[PDB]
Amino acid sequence: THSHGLFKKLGIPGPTPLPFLGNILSYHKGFCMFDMECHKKYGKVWGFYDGQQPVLAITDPDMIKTVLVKECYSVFTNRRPFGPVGFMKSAISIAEDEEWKRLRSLLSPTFTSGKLKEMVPIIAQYGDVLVRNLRREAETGKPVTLKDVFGAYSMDVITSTSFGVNIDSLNNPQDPFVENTKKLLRFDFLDPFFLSITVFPFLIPILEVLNICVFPREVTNFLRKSVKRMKESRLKHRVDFLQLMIDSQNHKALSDLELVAQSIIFIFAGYETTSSVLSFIMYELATHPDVQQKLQEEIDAVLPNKAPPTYDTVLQMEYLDMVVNETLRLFPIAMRLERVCKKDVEINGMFIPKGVVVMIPSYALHRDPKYWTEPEKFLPERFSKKNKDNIDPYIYTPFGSGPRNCIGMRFALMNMKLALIRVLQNFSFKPCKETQIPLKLSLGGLLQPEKPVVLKVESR
Ligand code: HEM
Numbered sequence: 001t002h003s004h005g006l007f008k009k010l011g012i013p014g015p016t017p018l019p020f021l022g023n024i025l026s027y028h029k030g031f032c033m034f035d036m037e038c039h040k041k042y043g044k045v046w047g048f049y050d051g052q053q054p055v056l057a058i059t060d061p062d063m064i065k066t067v068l069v070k071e072c073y074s075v076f077t078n079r080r081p082f083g084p085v086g087f088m089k090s091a092i093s094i095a096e097d098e099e100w101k102r103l104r105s106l107l108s109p110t111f112t113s114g115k116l117k118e119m120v121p122i123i124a125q126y127g128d129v130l131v132r133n134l135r136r137e138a139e140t141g142k143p144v145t146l147k148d149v150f151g152a153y154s155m156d157v158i159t160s161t162s163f164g165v166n167i168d169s170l171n172n173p174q175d176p177f178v179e180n181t182k183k184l185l186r187f188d189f190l191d192p193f194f195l196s197i198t199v200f201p202f203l204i205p206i207l208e209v210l211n212i213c214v215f216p217r218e219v220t221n222f223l224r225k226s227v228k229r230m231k232e233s234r235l236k237h238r239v240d241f242l243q244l245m246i247d248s249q250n251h252k253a254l255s256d257l258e259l260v261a262q263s264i265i266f267i268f269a270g271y272e273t274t275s276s277v278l279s280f281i282m283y284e285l286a287t288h289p290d291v292q293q294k295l296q297e298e299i300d301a302v303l304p305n306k307a308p309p310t311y312d313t314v315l316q317m318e319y320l321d322m323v324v325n326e327t328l329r330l331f332p333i334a335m336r337l338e339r340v341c342k343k344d345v346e347i348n349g350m351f352i353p354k355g356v357v358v359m360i361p362s363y364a365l366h367r368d369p370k371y372w373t374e375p376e377k378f379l380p381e382r383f384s385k386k387n388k389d390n391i392d393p394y395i396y397t398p399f400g401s402g403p404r405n406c407i408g409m410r411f412a413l414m415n416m417k418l419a420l421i422r423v424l425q426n427f428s429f430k431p432c433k434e435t436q437i438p439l440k441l442s443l444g445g446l447l448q449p450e451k452p453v454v455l456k457v458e459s460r
């Protein structure tokens with residue numbers, strides 16, 4: 001069509017698009033397979049169309065640094081709009097340009113290492129809860145699906161960190177927080193709805209005037225009311241995500257609806273993501289028990305006699321840092337990094353026209369043989385103390401990079417590591433007969449396993 005000749009004029013290789021559809025039919029193998037395929041068949045830079053939207057993929061480390069870090073505030077500042085957002089347009093991950101710079105300033109101190117150290121005791125409290133509910137499942141003599149145990153854990157930390165709500169999600173699935181928040185699963189961008197709106201971006205403004213929100217509106221209105229009630233209910237900082245935005249509420253000021261929007265994004269950002277990575281980590285520990293043994297030995301060394309973890313101790317365990325990093329290399333759940341080019345610009349000898357989405361194939365780079373030897377093998381020694389300097393930080397980007405990287409990286413890493421320390425110091429995980437030995441990945445818009453990971457759990 002009239003927008004499909006762009007990459008031909010610039011002389012950029014890519015699959016030939018179809019009218020009205022672009023290359024979305026090539027998504028039948030999934031985002032990951034499509035990205036790795038184009039990397040093999042086109043080299044270091046290629047292009048394709050999500051409907052009428054042109055997308056340029058870049059793999060040069062210098063270009064990635066220019067897009068994500070150097071020319072970030074000037075050119076590559078925002079992400080592609082993804083659908084009808086409603087009042088959630090004020091969320092930090094959805095805000096654009098000056099509003100984003102303001103909100104990120106108003107929210108950066110919330111994710112300081114100092115504030116994270118003050119959050120460790122609260123998160124550790126539900127590590128003991130996870131172990132208690134894990135032992136009962138171990139006594140059943142039957143395999144357990146890790147998504148439910150970790151999802152229960154990830155919910156308990158989120159509620160206790162975002163608010164003061166202490167809950168046992170696995171045993172108390174009735175509290176209004178547990179019910180509504182359990183409907184904040186990740187967005188399958190290859191489903192009929194999202195595939196439709198990428199082909200029909202003109203329908204996004206229509207959906208907004210019908211008050212059709214991409215987030216379930218019942219959960220949003222419930223959460224807005226609960227925050228409005230809790231603000232009066234405390235009208236003892238307790239290292240509370242909501243409180244840290246209330247005391248900071250008194251650049252510019254953070255509004256009440258803005259505060260509500262950020263709180264929901266933190267719940268959304270850390271419920272399935274935390275549980276998914278924790279499930280991937282345990283799968284690789286079962287199929288590679290030598291790693292699990294050394295990790296279980298390192299946990300006992302730093303924290304003897306099943307000692308509770310600490311900010312100073314978690315940041316000390318080196319082999320635990322290797323297991324999370326290598327799992328995030330194999331399974332970067334974002335799969336991709338996107339920036340919208342807001343003006344004509346030339347980067348590293350390449351012309352990027354206005355309006356083109358620049359894409360960085362994190363999954364494709366993480367499994368590229370030109371940077372990783374035996375990429376499919378899960379060798380956690382890639383990040384040893386003497387081999388962790390060879391890795392290019394712009395090829396391995398599990399949390400993104402630049403001033404729009406993950407704002408909750410330290411929390412997520414701490415939260416996951418605190419969970420791993422407590423569970424491996426009491427249990428061992430064995431591959432049962434209901435476990436997929438190859439672990440086929442899903443073909444949709446999510447980086448999740450095809451079948452849920454079920455493993456045998458024994459007590460130590
Ligand atoms: C293991 C879990 C997580 C992973 C793998 C992850 C990864 C990412 C990635 C790749 C991005 C995009 C950065 C880019 O565009 O360059 C991002 C953005 C973001 N993440 Fe996470 N994330 C995780 C958990 C969390 C959690 C628990 C929070 C809660 C505070 C959080 C808050 C955010 C925010 C606020 C952004 C948007 C930053 C901005 O737009 O300025 N993330 N994350």
Ligand SMILES: O=C(Nc1cc(C(F)(F)F)ccc1-n1ccnc1)N(Cc1cccc(O)c1)c1ccccc1Cl
Pocket residue numbers: 079080091093094186265268269270273333334336337338339406
């Ligand atoms: O933005 C992402 N997630 C996200 C989205 C929302 C929102 F939609 F409601 F606004 C809210 C929270 C998060 N969230 C999850 C973990 N931390 C932040 N990404 C990366 C990404 C995706 C697409 C384009 C792009 O440039 C960057 C992500 C991260 C981990 C797993 C899966 C994803 Cl899709």
